[PDB]
Every structure is written in structure tokens, then in C-alpha cells.
Amino acid sequence: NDALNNIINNARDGCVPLNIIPLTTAAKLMVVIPDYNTYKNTCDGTTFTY
Amino acid sequence: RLYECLYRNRDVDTDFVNEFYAYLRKHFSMMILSDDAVVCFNSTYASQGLVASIKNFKSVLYYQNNVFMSEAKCWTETDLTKGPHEFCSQHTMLVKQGDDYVYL
Amino acid sequence: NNELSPVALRQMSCAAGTTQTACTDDNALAYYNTTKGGRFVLALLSDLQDLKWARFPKSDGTGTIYTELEPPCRFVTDTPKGPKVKYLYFIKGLNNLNRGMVLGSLAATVRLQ
Amino acid sequence: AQSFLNRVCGVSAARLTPCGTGTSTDVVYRAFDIYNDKVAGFAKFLKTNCCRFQEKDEDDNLIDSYFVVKRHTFSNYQHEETIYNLLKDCPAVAKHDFFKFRIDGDMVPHISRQRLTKYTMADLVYALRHFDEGNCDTLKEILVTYNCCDDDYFNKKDWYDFVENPDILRVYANLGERVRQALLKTVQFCDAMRNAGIVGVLTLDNQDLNGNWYDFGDFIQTTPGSGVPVVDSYYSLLMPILTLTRALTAESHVDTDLTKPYIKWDLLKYDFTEERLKLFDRYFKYWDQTYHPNCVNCLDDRCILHCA
Ligand SMILES: Nc1nc2c(ncn2[C@@H]2O[C@H](COP(=O)(O)OP(=O)(O)NP(=O)(O)O)[C@@H](O)[C@H]2O)c(=O)[nH]1
């Protein structure tokens, strides 16, 4: 309830699209990769950004 | 009048719509299931492009459905004593039962 | 050879005004278009400087409908009346093409300066 | 005979080599949108009265820029002179050039349009909306002349498919800028003509691919300030192409320019009921029907479909 309540208050009258709530207020990302060459670009090193 | 009612008028003209629909049922009788169709269309008209033969169908699909209906899955029968080549995955045969001829 | 329009139609006479039932008896130059779904008035042309409302009864008589006119369109016509500063109007709800036939016929077979 | 070429080259670029056969017209095979009291439709007719000249750059190699001079009657000549001299100010008008020339013993009037393109937009719309892989030459010429693809790409079989070879999307996506520029120039022409008091109907077989306009032979004049563009056939025919060549993708950029990063919209914004109105006002200004973005306000089903 911290991040969600913080970000809803930023809206015009508390209405935001659903497709962004897990994009900002989710604490666990899960990435699925088909093959090594595709793994190279995204999940490089031990930490990555997205 | 088709061009008139298409790109000039603004509201529906029931008289012309009924006229065109009667024409369509006169020269383009259809029988429709859920995307599987059979058409008994006039020949001497379609030969000179007054009812769509097959290439108008191909062009319409190409520009309004974003697919390409290749002309290898589209049958065409030049005779009528044998029914449609394939409808609902049932070939049609003309047979003599009882005393008359029926389609099975 | 996309043409504006051939075989157009012509005028009727009806009352107009600036507010509600301002129809004295008849003050306008309505332009008819006798469609098979009823006679369709098209345009207006009055020497009165502005008007807002006009009213032409239907084919039943009991049904008289009030119509709402354009802002002014001003020009002069050279006719047996000599100099004639007229003011032309249409009916709102009118698409561009109807202005097309009305103006095309008026400028093709009538005189203006 | 030969003085005709030098006369056609008025004040610019005498590098012309006629594609016809001298001082006679050439027959071409293009599309039209004709409706005059007898016959309507939208199909491929046969044009006959066009003496076509081609301009070529230095090293004397051909380049896409033509001189389409047309011969017709006398009344059309003076009517076009009046209307063109009225509409000369607008930037979106192909620079006409009039003269009177003799052939055998007749003082035949000429009209000399300048710097046009090979294929007018009607040809693009037709040849893309009436596809037939057995006979598609105009589409290939248009696609290879504008650096979209190269002629070696047309050997990869099933090149026109949308299921297999999905790269045809990117191939078609190279005409978007041209289409958008043409739309903007049409808007400019509509504004200029409405200001200059002219009345007529626009057509797809006038605006060549660059954007220039011509053929004022059907318009008539009125008092300035009360002109009107009849535009229903134009957009109603160009509509299915606008989302196949993706001409609106140039708007998802910070300055309407394909050399800049995408606009970073705020995530929380969801209304978006003003950008749609702005775009519809800038591109489709004269489309004569109310457009309400929020489809809830629509009157009845027909308007719902038209706004969707
Ligand atoms: N610009 C251009 N037009 C070409 C060419 N080949 C054929 N055309 C066609 O030839 C015509 C030239 O323009 P024009 O004749 O003035 O158009 P129009 O609508 O037929 N004139 P009008 O309305 O008076 O009958 C157009 O229809 C155009 O599509 C070409 O190489 N360049």
C-alpha cells in the first residue's frame, strides 16, 4: 500500500491505466528468454536495467 | 446510381438498396455457413465483370483483411449435375434412390 | 471528368425571420430539391440583411417546421432589377456538396457581379 | 517539328528528350475517377491527348521529372487561364505555363504543366487496392523509383504475402512520409482555394505523388471568402491506404521529424481527448461531418461506426 497510494494521488482524480500498476509498484520481475543470443542483450551481467 | 448513392448522398436510400439487393439475389445467390460458403453465380455477367468472379475477392481480401487468399484453395465447377466440390468437408454426389435423383 | 453536378433543381418562395415565429407571410427565396422522400428545400436568398428562422409547412399542412439559416453571404446580381445587393443563405445541417450544387447552378445559369 | 521542344522549355532546364514521337500525342494507361452525366466508376481508362516530355539531369541520365503538356479546346484554355491566374499564389500548385502554338494550319492552344511525376496518386491507390500478382508493374515501378526497395528484392518468391515474408510491412512503410506530405499539401490547397473563392470537387487523379496539383478545368469561381471544397471521394478512397503505409507514424516524434527521439508521454495520462481533435483538425480540416472523440456522445449506430 505505500507505492500504489503514493502514485494514485499523482493522478488527476485518482484514475490510472491498469497496464502501469505492475510496471511501477511490483517488487519482483520475471523474465523469460528463448535463447542465449536474446539473453545477451537484456539480462547482461549480474544486474540489469529495464 | 450506385456511385451516386455511395460517394454523393449522405443518408440511406431504401428504394435503391432494395433494387440492388433484388439484383444481387437474382445474379449472386448465396448459401452461407460460419465462413464456409458456396455461390451459384451467373457466368455471362461475371465473364465481363459485373459480378465478382474470383480476382475481386482476392483484391478485397488483400486490401481489407491483410491476408493473401492464394488461388489454390478456391474450387470452381463448370457443371451443375454434380454439386459443389466441397462444402463443410462433405463431397456431394448425385444418386438415384427410389424413382428420382437426390443429392447425398 | 468529375463534374460538380448536372440536372439540378430550382427555387420556391417561403417566409423567414430572425426569431421564432417571425414569418410575416413570405420573405425569402427558398431553393427546392424535390426528392421522392419529400420536397427538400436547399438554400435561401433574402434582401433582408440578416434572418435566423424560416418555416415552410409540410405536405400535410398541419405540419409546419421551423428552419435555421446561415450567417450572411453577400453579393450583387445584375438583373432586370439593375443593381441588386442580395444576401444568400442555406439551411444548417447542409453538407459541402449541397452548397456545391446550389452555388454551381446559381453561378452557371444566373448572373452575378 | 524540333522548335516545339525548345518552346516547351520556357525558362528552365532545356534538358528534354521526348518520350513520344515528335509533335504528336502519346497514349497512356492510367486510372481515373470520372462521373459526368453518363458514366461513373473508378477504373483504368485510356488517356490519349498528352504530349509527354522528360527532363534529365547532368551526365544526361533520366530522372523523375516530367512535362505533361495537353492540347484541348479554346474555351477550356481561357477558363483555365482565369482560374490559374487567380490561384497562382498558392505554393501547392504545379507551375503552369500557357502558350499558343501552330501545328499545320491551326492555332491550337496548349497547356504545359511543369515538373510533374510519372504516376499520379490515383495510380498508387488503384494498383494497391486492386492487387493481382500476375500483373503488377506500376506498383513495382513506384516501389523501386522511390528507393523503398531494390529490384533484386522482387526475386524472393512470395514477396507480396502478408502471412509469410512479413518484411513487406517495413517495405511499404517507406511511403508514409510521401503520403503525409501529400495530405498536408492538399490541406494547403483547400485553404488557398477557399480564400480565393473557387468551387469544385477534388479527385485522386490530379494530385501527383510529389503533392503538386493541377487540372482546374472543372472548377468555377464565386465571390472571395465563400468557396467550398467538395471532398468525399478523395478521403473516402485514400482511407484504406493511410494505415497500410503508416503515414501517421511521423507524429510519434518530438517535432514531426524522423531524426529525433520519440515523445516521452507521461504514464498517468489517459484522457487523450485533445490530441485526437488537434490531429483531425490539422489533417482532415474540410471533412464535412462532425467527429466526436468520445464515442459515448454519438447519436446513433452509424455515427458510432464513423467515429470508430
Ligand atoms: N502528370 C502526369 N500525368 C500523367 C502521366 N501519364 C498519364 N497521366 C494522366 O494524364 C492526366 C494529365 O492531367 P489532366 O489531363 O489535366 O487531368 P484531367 O482530369 O484528365 N483533365 P480534365 O478534367 O480537364 O479532363 C491525368 O489524368 C494523369 O493521371 C504522367 O506521366 N504524368
D149 is in an annotated binding site: no
Q: Which helix (H) or strand (E) holds D179?
A: helix D176-195
Can you say how many angstroms the Cα of residue D119 is from the centroid of all Cα atoms in its chain? 9
State in Å: Cα D68 to ligand 1 middle.
Answer: 8
C64-92 as b/e: b if 16+ CB within 10 A: eeebebbeebebebeeeeeeeebbbbbbe
Nine-digit cell at B50?
A: 459485373
- Please judge whether D200 and C4 are an interchain contact, meaning their C-beta atoms are less than 8 angstroms apart: yes
Whole-number CA gyration radius for chain C: 14
State in Å: Cα D73 to ligand 1 middle.
Answer: 16
Q: Give DSSP secondary structure letters for chain B.
A: -HHHHHHT-SS--HHHHHHHHHHHHHHEEEEE-SS-EEEEE-HHHHTTTSS--SHHHHHHHHHHTS----TTS----S-SSS--S-BTTB---EEEETTEEEE-
Which chains, if any, share at least 3 CB pairs under 8 A with chain D? A, B, C
One-letter amino acid at B65 equals N
Q: Which residues of D touch A6 (CB under 8 A)?
A: none
* Active-site pick, B11, B35, B79, B100: B35
HSE, CB side, 13 Å, CA atoms: give it for residue B7: 23
Compute the distance between CA of residue C100 and CA of residue C98 in angstroms, rounded to an integer: 5
Helix, strand, or coil here: D7? helix
Measured by CA distance, the residue closest to atom 20 of ligand 1 is C1
B55-64 helix and D121-129 helix, angle to the nearest 10 degrees = 110
Is the CB of D116 inside a 6 Å radius of any atom of ligand 1? yes
Q: Are strands D228-230 and D198-201 parallel, antiparallel or unpaired?
A: parallel
Contacts of D167 by beta carbon, 8 Å cutoff, 6+ apart? none
Count Cβ atoms within 10 A of the Cβ of residue D151 and give its class: 0-12 exposed, 13-18 middle, 19 or more buried.
Answer: exposed
CA nearest neighbour of B77 among B48, B104, B103, B38: B38
Q: Dihedral sign for Cα D105, D110, D114, D117, please.
A: negative
> D interface mutation test: which of C45, C92, C96 has the most D CBs within 10 A?
C96
Contacts of B104 by beta carbon, 8 Å cutoff, 6+ apart? B92, B93, B95, B97
Can you say how many angstroms the Cα of residue B73 is from the centroid of all Cα atoms in its chain? 15
Nine-digit cell at D207?
A: 494530385
Helix, strand, or coil here: D101? coil
Compute the distance between CA of residue C99 and CA of residue B18 in angstroms, rounded to an integer: 29
Give resolution in angstroms: 3.8
C79: DSSP letter: E
D137 is in an annotated binding site: no
| Cα distances (Å, whole numbers) of residue D217 to C59, D77, D300 | 41, 9, 39
Contact D223, D198 (CB under 8 A): no
One-letter amino acid at C55 equals R
Helix, strand, or coil here: C83? strand
Q: Dihedral sign for Cα D45, B20, C6, C84, please.
A: negative
One-letter amino acid at D195 equals N
Compute the distance between CA of residue D70 and CA of residue D97 in angstroms, rounded to an integer: 11
Measured by CA distance, the residue closest to atom 23 of ligand 1 is C1
Compute the distance between CA of residue C80 and CA of residue C95 in angstroms, rounded to an integer: 32
Q: Does residue B36 have an active-site annotation?
A: yes
Compute the distance between CA of residue D246 and CA of residue B29 in angstroms, rounded to an integer: 38
CA nearest neighbour of D11 among D101, D112, D132: D112
Q: Which helix (H) or strand (E) holds C64?
A: strand C64-68
* Active-site pick, B13, B15, B36, B59: B36
Can you say how many angstroms the Cα of residue C61 is from the centroid of all Cα atoms in its chain? 21
Nine-digit cell at D241?
A: 491506404
State in Å: Cα B2 to ligand 1 middle.
Answer: 25
Backbone angles phi and psi of D234, in degrees to 5: -55, -65
Contacts of D118 by beta carbon, 8 Å cutoff, 6+ apart? D64, D66, D141, D145
CA nearest neighbour of D237 among D138, D121, D142, D141: D121
* Number of residues written out for chain B: 104
* Nearest residue in chain B measured CA to CA from D40: B3
Q: Name the method of structure determination.
A: cryo-EM
Compute the distance between CA of residue D12 and CA of residue D14 in angstroms, rounded to an integer: 6
Q: Are strands D109-112 and D198-201 parallel, antiparallel or unpaired?
A: unpaired
Q: What is the dihedral of CA B39, B42, B44, B47, to 10 degrees?
A: -30
Contact D287, D229 (CB under 8 A): no
Q: What is the dihedral of CA C106, C107, C108, C109, to 10 degrees?
A: 50
Which atom of ligand 1 is nearest to C2's Cα? 23
Query: Where would I find the beta strands (DSSP E) of chain D?
Result: 16-18, 51-56, 62-71, 98-100, 109-112, 198-201, 220-221, 228-230
Nine-digit cell at D235?
A: 478521403
Nine-digit cell at D113?
A: 504543366
